[PDB]
Amino acid sequence: GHMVEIGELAPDFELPDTELKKVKLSALKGKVVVLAFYPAAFTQVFRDSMAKFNQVNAVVLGISVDPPFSNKAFKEHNKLNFTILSDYNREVVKKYNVAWEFPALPGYVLAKRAVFVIDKEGKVRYKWVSDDPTKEPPYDEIEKVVKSLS
């Protein structure tokens, strides 16, 4: 099975960004990385909460199971300045154990709202996973963790 814990080497993966370019996690070693998983692009509640990662001092990788084409429109609409990846085959939500089935859509597997901060050595240093998709992560704490790793 898959279980991600602090201190472990973050599971590597390669997913397409909004321009269909392959982005590999391990290629980011030497830089602090923040994985920001979200359930679905265009979820309605002005601007999506993913925009709160715009000012984080690290390489933020937004990740959802939405297709690249839609994530591109999502990224532009909400002025997200970071890389947005499409885990269309659910490979990564499984590797990070942040998968769940959407209540209203039988068999639709998507990511839980989650955040993982990875250090320059590629190890997991912070983990936050909310079963409730409406909850937002502690941005302040996350930024402080990023700082300690910079």
Side-chain angles (χ1 to χ4, degrees):
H2 291 288
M3 209 71 78
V4 177
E5 306 289 344
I6 295 304
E8 295 179 352
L9 185 65
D12 201 8
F13 60 81
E14 189 175 63
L15 292 175
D17 65 11
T18 53
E19 294 300 307
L20 307 179
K21 180 184 179 186
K22 289 174 171 53
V23 176
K24 181 183 292 295
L25 180 63
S26 57
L28 286 168
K29 279 192 174 64
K31 300 172 183 173
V32 178
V33 178
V34 175
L35 305 183
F37 287 91
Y38 58 101
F42 297 111
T43 290
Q44 298 302 299
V45 188
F46 169 34
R47 184 171 297 163
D48 193 84
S49 63
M50 281 300 286
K52 287 173 171 52
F53 289 107
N54 280 338
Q55 276 181 289
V56 175
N57 185 28
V59 176
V60 180
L61 301 179
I63 304 173
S64 75
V65 302
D66 302 297
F69 326 105
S70 288
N71 264 337
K72 175 169 178 175
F74 175 65
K75 171 179 171 59
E76 308 189 329
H77 176 68
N78 294 287
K79 305 181 178 302
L80 304 183
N81 65 33
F82 52 94
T83 292
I84 299 296
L85 307 181
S86 294
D87 185 36
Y88 64 85
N89 271 160
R90 282 67 168 186
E91 175 190 307
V92 184
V93 290
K94 289 184 292 186
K95 286 181 178 175
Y96 281 75
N97 190 40
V98 292
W100 68 303
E101 172 177 41
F102 197 63
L105 300 171
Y108 187 77
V109 178
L110 71 185
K112 291 179 175 178
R113 180 79 59 171
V115 175
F116 291 90
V117 179
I118 298 169
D119 61 31
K120 296 177 184 178
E121 292 67 50
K123 298 186 183 302
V124 180
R125 302 296 295 278
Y126 174 83
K127 173 185 174 182
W128 178 85
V129 180
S130 183
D131 287 356
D132 181 340
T134 69
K135 294 181 180 176
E136 290 186 53
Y139 305 105
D140 180 60
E141 187 183 334
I142 291 167
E143 304 185 315
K144 292 173 180 178
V145 171
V146 165
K147 180 186 177 185
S148 70
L149 305 176
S150 306

